[PDB]
Amino acid sequence: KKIGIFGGTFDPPHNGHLLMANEVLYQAGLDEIWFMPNQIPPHKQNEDYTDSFHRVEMLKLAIQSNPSFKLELVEMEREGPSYTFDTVSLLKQRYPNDQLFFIIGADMIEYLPKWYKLDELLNLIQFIGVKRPGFHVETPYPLLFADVPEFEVSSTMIRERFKSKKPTDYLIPDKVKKYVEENGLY
Amino acid sequence: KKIGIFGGTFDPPHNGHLLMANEVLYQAGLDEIWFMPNQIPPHKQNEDYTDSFHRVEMLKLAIQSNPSFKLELVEMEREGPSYTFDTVSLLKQRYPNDQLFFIIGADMIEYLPKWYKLDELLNLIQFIGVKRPGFHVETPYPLLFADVPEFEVSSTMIRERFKSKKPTDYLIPDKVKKYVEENGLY
Ligand SMILES: Nc1ncnc2c1ncn2[C@H]1O[C@H](COP(=O)(O)OP(=O)(O)OC[C@H]2O[C@@H]([n+]3cccc(C(=O)O)c3)[C@H](O)[C@@H]2O)[C@H](O)[C@@H]1O
Ligand SMILES: Nc1ncnc2c1ncn2[C@H]1O[C@H](COP(=O)(O)OP(=O)(O)OC[C@H]2O[C@@H]([n+]3cccc(C(=O)O)c3)[C@H](O)[C@@H]2O)[C@H](O)[C@@H]1O
To answer: Which residues span the domain enclosing B57?
Structure first.
């Protein structure tokens, strides 16, 4: 079972995610994409990253309509900063017969260096890069690519959008927008 | 009444369209965007557009959920190649008290020169340029700009996608995908 782990803090989740996952899904020839949400984002524990419960909620709304997208709360499986090396380690254990790939966008590609235990991690799983507008890939690390239309949208956009009351339409599912307004986020 | 005429042949209409329009609507402080479908695309009369009726049908689906998006079939009422001069002329007559702006993406911007009566049209109404990924703005014509998130997605993408059965999800309203599938398009 060829699976693509798509970790992210999704605060909030937006179309850009949906499109990349859905495109990587096809391009890397995967069976299902796994949206894995951080308990507490490793690279940002000093940034004020929404309570998790709302992230997993917003996440569930953004991916319901796609049969091939599946939630994965394995990192929510208990306390401490969610370091991919630790998680992937664990995952390769629960699912030893499945083919696993991790997915990141241009953005993170630039961050590979600052990233806990990347040299051990890269040995565990293979990485798939996409290419996000504004950032750019180039890494000196083993990484496979997947052509994916560039879509300029990041959560931080929406958050500011959602606070200065700017559009946010056609950038996040109409379901995710409501949850935010409803549950008072951003 | 501040209006942004958003002409296109929309074959098919896609999120890129929806996104740009909804942004320009904000960025240029307009009251509503008018999606204006060609009867027969001026700049490509020897290609294949799809009979129109479907373009208007697909167009109608894409913009239903947005109260500020409106359909304008003015060009559909009177035969022959839909030249923006002729039309904007007429428009500036039916609506003498409303503020009218036209809208194009980097795509069209590059094309301003090969464009029936630009010099006289430019006199009639003000254009608002966006910027599409792949193309790029630079023109020697009087044009205003509206910052709008780059979204690399074209109808010609979809058409090919919809015919080599590739994803198309998250690129066109799901209502638009159905119409195509049901009505045997592309
Ligand atoms: N338009 C777009 N086109 C393509 N991708 C886009 C995108 N907008 C956001 N994305 C991003 O969406 C995904 C994730 O969303 P987002 O919430 O922004 O992701 P983010 O919070 O920045 O972090 C990405 C993941 O990498 C892991 N990480 C990060 C840093 C350090 C370490 C470590 O162990 O040391 C691990 C962790 O699992 C995290 O969930 C991809 O990472 C991608 O970069
Ligand atoms: N991702 C994206 N980001 C921003 N904009 C994007 C876009 N993808 C498509 N678009 C385009 O969508 C809009 C229209 O859709 P589309 O079907 O592609 O538009 P298109 O068929 O290329 O032509 C644009 C409009 O210009 C007029 N025109 C064109 C050529 C010659 C003459 C003449 O007077 O001789 C007149 C005509 O009224 C038409 O409605 C904008 O033109 C924009 O460029």
So the answer is: 1-186
